[PDB]
UniProtKB/Swiss-Prot annotation, chain B:
Protein name: Spike protein S1
Source species, domain of life: Viruses
Lineage of producing organism: Viruses, Riboviria, Orthornavirae, Pisuviricota, Pisoniviricetes
Organism, scientific name: Severe acute respiratory syndrome coronavirus 2 (2019-nCoV)
Known outcome of mutating residue 19 to E: In strain: Omicron/XBB.1.5, Omicron/EG.5.1
Glycosylation, residue list: 40
Function, in words: Attaches the virion to the cell membrane by interacting with host receptor, initiating the infection. The major receptor is host ACE2. When S2/S2' has been cleaved, binding to the receptor triggers direct fusion at the cell membrane. When S2/S2' has not been cleaved, binding to the receptor results in internalization of the virus by endocytosis using host TFRC and GRM2 and leading to fusion of the virion membrane with the host endosomal membrane. Alternatively, may use NRP1/NRP2 and integrin as entry receptors.
Self-association state and partner proteins as the record states: Binds to host ACE2. RBD also interacts with the N-linked glycan on 'Asn-90' of ACE2. Cleavage of S generates a polybasic C-terminal sequence on S1 that binds to host Neuropilin-1 (NRP1) and Neuropilin-2 (NRP2) receptors. Interacts with host integrin alpha-5/beta-1 (ITGA5:ITGB1) and with ACE2 in complex with integrin alpha-5/beta-1 (ITGA5:ITGB1). May interact via cytoplasmic c-terminus with M protein. May interact (via N-terminus) with host bilirubin and biliverdin, thereby preventing antibody binding to the SARS-CoV-2 spike NTD via an allosteric mechanism.
Amino acid sequence: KNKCVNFNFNGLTGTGVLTESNKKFLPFQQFGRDIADTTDAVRDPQTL
Amino acid sequence: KNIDGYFKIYSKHTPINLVRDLPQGFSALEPLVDLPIGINITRFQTLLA
């Protein structure tokens, strides 16, 4: 956290700054996207 | 719904005050379970109690 990293969240590849989110994801949701279909927030593959 | 073999199913359960056997309004059905079956379906039938 708090660092630029090359992440791979079980296929959701990319590069960015990972940090704890204030939003709420659905019970069956893996990730979410913004208006431009860009990965804005994700859930850990192992942790909820 | 069979989605390329994924027999995805949604669901929702809410209260009602029945008027005409189909109360009107609005809601949203959430995904219940993913089912990677991979089999073709063309008909169905209900199981009544």
